[PDB]
């Protein structure tokens, strides 16, 4: 799997590590007592939307239909 | 040498050397500490998942 895109977000456990994702080629494994990395090793930023309830959609369809 | 100024310099060295034999040994304590810290750094940073 490719090396995850550099992400400076990390979470310390014992002492501050000052993790720099640009200081190493391959990301070192996360030791329990040292660091936890950010979620989504392989993730992108998108925009999504919730799907409104079906009965609420039918009331909107009936309003537009009665409107036109 | 009959010169007191000349011997004065050779006597300062002997008095310095007298102490350097003692103080120079504290570098041994520096090694024991540095060597002891490197082991703690390897154990404290050893892998656990
Ligand atoms: C003569 C031969 C030379 C001697 C060799 C001795 C060492 C032999 C090692 C045998 C290990 C075989 C079983 C290991 C299984 C358990 C550990 C393991 O699975 O690895 C966990 C993990 C790697 O996992 P990932 O990198 O995330 O890979 C995931 C891939 N999807 O590695 C570890 O966590 C290290 C294992 C725990 C270390 C515990 C330290 C114990 C201290 C021992 C000192 C004894 C003190 C004596 C007094």
């Amino acid at each position: 799997a490719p090396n995850p895109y550099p992400n400076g977000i990390h979470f310390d456990r014992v002492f501050p590590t000052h993790y720099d994702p640009l200081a190493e080629t391959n990301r070192t494994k996360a030791n329990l007592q040292l660091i936890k990395y950010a979620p989504g090793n392989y993730s992108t930023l998108v925009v999504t939307s919730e799907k409104l309830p079906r009965p609420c959609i039918r009331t909107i369809q009936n309003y537009r239909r009665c409107q036109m | 040498y009959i010169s007191s100024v000349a011997e004065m310099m050779f006597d300062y060295t002997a008095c310095l050397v007298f102490y350097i034999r003692i103080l120079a040994q504290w570098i041994r304590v520096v090694l024991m500490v540095v060597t002891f810290i490197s082991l703690s750094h390897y154990v404290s940073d050893f892998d656990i998942t």
Side-chain angles (χ1 to χ4, degrees):
Chain A
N3 277 313
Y5 188 76
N7 186 346
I9 298 302
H10 66 284
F11 308 102
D12 303 86
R13 323 308 229 180
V14 173
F15 64 87
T17 56
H18 303 300
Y19 169 70
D20 183 8
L22 307 178
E24 59 179 353
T25 297
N26 306 318
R27 196 177 73 173
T28 170
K29 64 170 72 64
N31 299 133
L32 280 168
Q33 80 293 18
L34 295 180
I35 198 178
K36 177 173 70 181
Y37 292 118
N41 298 346
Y42 312 97
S43 57
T44 59
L45 176 61
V46 306
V47 70
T48 188
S49 176
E50 286 290 347
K51 200 154 62 184
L52 296 184
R54 183 173 293 164
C56 180
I57 286 173
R58 297 287 154 82
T59 53
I60 296 165
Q61 295 175 334
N62 190 311
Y63 178 84
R64 297 186 68 215
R65 189 176 63 199
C66 190
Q67 192 183 30
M68 63 172 68
Chain B
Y1 311 105
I2 61 181
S3 180
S4 59
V5 176
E7 300 298 346
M8 186 193 297
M9 313 309 297
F10 289 78
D11 287 77
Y12 286 146
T13 58
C15 186
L16 265 288
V17 172
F18 183 65
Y19 283 97
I20 298 299
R21 294 175 194 272
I22 299 296
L23 309 180
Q25 305 306 331
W26 282 97
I27 300 184
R28 303 184 186 274
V29 183
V30 169
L31 267 65
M32 296 195 289
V33 169
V34 171
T35 306
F36 181 77
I37 296 303
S38 59
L39 179 59
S40 304
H41 169 80
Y42 188 81
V43 172
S44 64
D45 295 68
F46 194 81
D47 310 76
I48 185 66
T49 63

